């Protein structure tokens, strides 16, 4: 297979390069405009404030940037991200390998503990997921059988019914773990339908950018909400595990 | 299994709750540090520049925050969506690492990202299994020759196998964990602790994004910048085995 792997490797590289071109094309113009806007803000501030040098305003912006980067809020001047609810949720983002990162560890102790927490945590959760997966399969297939049998009752072929059940399985999951949550989050997080789908998928793929995080919003008095989502994650991931393995098979069939 | 899964579930929940307690204990004390630093910077600036009202400095910080939010960079290149950085970003997707140190701003960008990942992750998954086996068999070929030396000192061969496999996951570790931590220490101006934290957060595919090499060709060693994706690919393979061996151990007990 060594020839095939070189072919596969180059295929992935081409895929990344094509991804890179598309992402640049779509994202770079806005990033260049943001840069121009920072520059416009500096030039207006110098014109307004003659006792400030270009270079002193430069340090202010760098120092401000570092503080915002540490999670400082521009809106306030006062003085919990690590309340038991959010801290539980943060631990959840580790073992799931989602790793939103919308709140960072500041302590060397925090980081050192995180290493061993993850090294023990991820494989542990991996085992549970396989378990929940097997359980999920049994549950749905036994359930799908009854409606599967109604198709069999109207005399349709058994080999046809397996694939109908397979397709039906995919539909059931999507409604329960893709569309419902997107609709849920749309209402709860005041996101757009597309923002919500983006979040849902980025979450269940375990990519976890952290640009979008359900519950994170400081204002919301719904701490019970955030872990409840973590149960959706638990159930969602097994569903998406199946989807991700199966789409690989589709690519295997194409190759 | 019924007992097993509910037992395992409760175990995981307890683990999460105990994790929560430990994190809150360590991290809640320092929550407001970045707010304190911003405030320090503001007040120090008002003292230095009497032509500036607290309210005018206020808008500057909001306007700067929005610019940075849009991907503007404090400048004193630097493009996160130049072909090099955009390649690396696409890499963060299919690997499921997802640093997010650079966010998508366009709804079109997000829409494409969905399909790019949904097709891209399994494709990489396939290649990873492939690259895992190819290296695995090649390493195993190497393992046999090491096993021979142990065999010729009359170590029982089952002991030799485990000894070799342990050496297996140790040479891999030195090759992919220690070298980078040293590399990053020098290259990124990180502490050896920050570097191992980065390496492991990376190879576990957690990808917080608090620490990122960046694969950004800057100068001095520009070749190495995208080259670390090579370490990631190779490293991920080694760490896959590490994760499974830790996982299998938990199953064993």
């Amino acid at each position, epitope marked *: 297979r060594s020839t095939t792997l070189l072919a596969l490797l180059a295929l992935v590289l081409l895929y990344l390069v094509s991804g890179a071109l598309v992402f640049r094309a779509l994202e770079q113009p806005h990033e260049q405009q943001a840069q121009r806007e920072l520059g416009e803000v500096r030039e207006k501030f110098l014109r307004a404030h003659p006792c400030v040098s270009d270079q002193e305003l430069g340090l202010l912006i760098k120092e401000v940037a570092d503080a915002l980067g540490g999670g400082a809020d521009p809106e306030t001047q006062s003085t919990s991200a690590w309340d038991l609810g959010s801290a539980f949720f943060f631990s959840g983002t580790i073992i799931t390998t989602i790793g939103y990162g919308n709140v960072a560890l500041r302590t060397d102790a925090g980081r050192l503990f995180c290493i061993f927490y993850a090294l023990v945590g991820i494989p542990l959760f991996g085992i549970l997921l396989a378990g929940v997966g097997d359980r999920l399969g049994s549950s749905l297939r036994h359930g799908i059988g009854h409606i599967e049998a109604i198709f069999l009752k109207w005399h349709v072929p058994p080999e046809l019914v397996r694939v109908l059940s397979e397709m039906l399985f995919l539909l059931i999951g999507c409604l329960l773990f893709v569309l419902t949550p997107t609709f849920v989050f749309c209402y709860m997080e005041d996101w757009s339908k597309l923002e919500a789908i983006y979040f849902v998928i980025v979450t269940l793929t375990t990519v976890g950018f952290g640009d979008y995080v359900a519950g994170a919003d400081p204002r919301q008095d719904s701490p019970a909400y955030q872990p409840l989502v973590w149960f959706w994650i638990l159930l969602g991931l097994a569903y998406f595990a199946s989807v991700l393995t199966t789409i690989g098979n589709w690519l295997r069939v194409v190759s | 299994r019924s007992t097993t899964l509910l037992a395992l579930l409760a175990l995981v929940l307890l683990y999460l709750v105990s994790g929560a307690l430990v994190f809150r204990a360590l991290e809640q004390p320092h929550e407001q540090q970045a707010q304190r630093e911003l405030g320090e910077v503001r007040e120090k600036f008002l003292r230095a520049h*009497p032509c500036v009202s607290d309210q005018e400095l206020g808008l500057l910080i909001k306007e700067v925050a929005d610019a940075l939010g849009g991907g503007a960079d404090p400048e004193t290149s630097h493009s996160a969506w130049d072909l090099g950085s955009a390649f690396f970003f696409s890499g963060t997707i299919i690997t499921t690492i997802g640093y997010g140190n650079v966010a998508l701003r366009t709804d079109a960008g997000r829409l494409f990202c969905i399909f790019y990942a949904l097709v891209g992750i399994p494709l990489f998954g396939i290649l990873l299994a492939g690259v895992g086996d190819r290296l695995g068999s090649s390493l195993r070929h190497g393992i046999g020759h090491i096993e021979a030396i142990f065999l010729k000192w009359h170590v029982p061969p089952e002991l030799v196998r485990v000894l070799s496999e342990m050496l297996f996951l140790l040479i891999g570790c030195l090759l992919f964990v220690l070298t980078p931590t040293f590399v990053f220490c020098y290259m990124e101006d990180w502490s050896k602790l920050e570097a191992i934290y980065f390496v492991i957060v990376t190879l576990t595919t957690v990808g917080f994004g608090d620490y990122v090499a960046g694969a950004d060709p800057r100068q001095d060693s520009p070749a190495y910048q995208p080259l670390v994706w090579f370490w990631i690919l190779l490293g991920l393979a080694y760490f896959a085995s590490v994760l499974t061996t830790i996982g299998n151990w938990l199953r064993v007990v």
Partner: antibody
Amino acid sequence: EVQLQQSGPELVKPGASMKTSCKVSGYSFTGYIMNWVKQRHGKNLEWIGLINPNTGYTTYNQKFKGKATLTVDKSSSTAYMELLSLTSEDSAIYYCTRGNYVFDYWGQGTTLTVSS
Amino acid sequence: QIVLTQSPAIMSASPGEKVTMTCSASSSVSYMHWYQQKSGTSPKRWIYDTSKLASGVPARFSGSGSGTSYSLTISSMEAEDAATYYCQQWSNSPPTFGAGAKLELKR
């Protein structure tokens, strides 16, 4: 009337250093950034560096990093430029000028001659 | 390290001629400023922020431009306009100047 009054022409030996001054009047010295500019007949007008007279903050053109030291006396509202280990390449007219984006007021200039 | 190019370096105008001198920037710049210098005297702020006239500057002077191309214009050349005109930029530190454009009277 905003005014920048520079000290007179200076003649110094190769290798010597030199210090020139600019007293401001008609405005608050500490309110505005102060700059020095070099005019040689052959070359472009060249920005040397700036000082914030209120904070003492300084930055230099990379081309003059080692050469030039800017300082101020807040009490006498006077800006100073020092030039070190002088060569004939430093023979020029030097101006102090005010501004943080545009140089809105200039001194009359001082002529430096480096010569044995 | 932004470079400003004034060409030609010297130019001549009969009284009543419309004159335009241009300043090319090696990369994009948000605002261009201009100084007038007559032999024996320091540069004077002439135009700032591309098209703003400094206090004493007579109305026959205009400035214009954007991006990497900027211009100073005299609607009708006068005797007292014979001088050297410099562009300068400060959209990027360090601020930089054109080599200047010397405008002589034609006779």
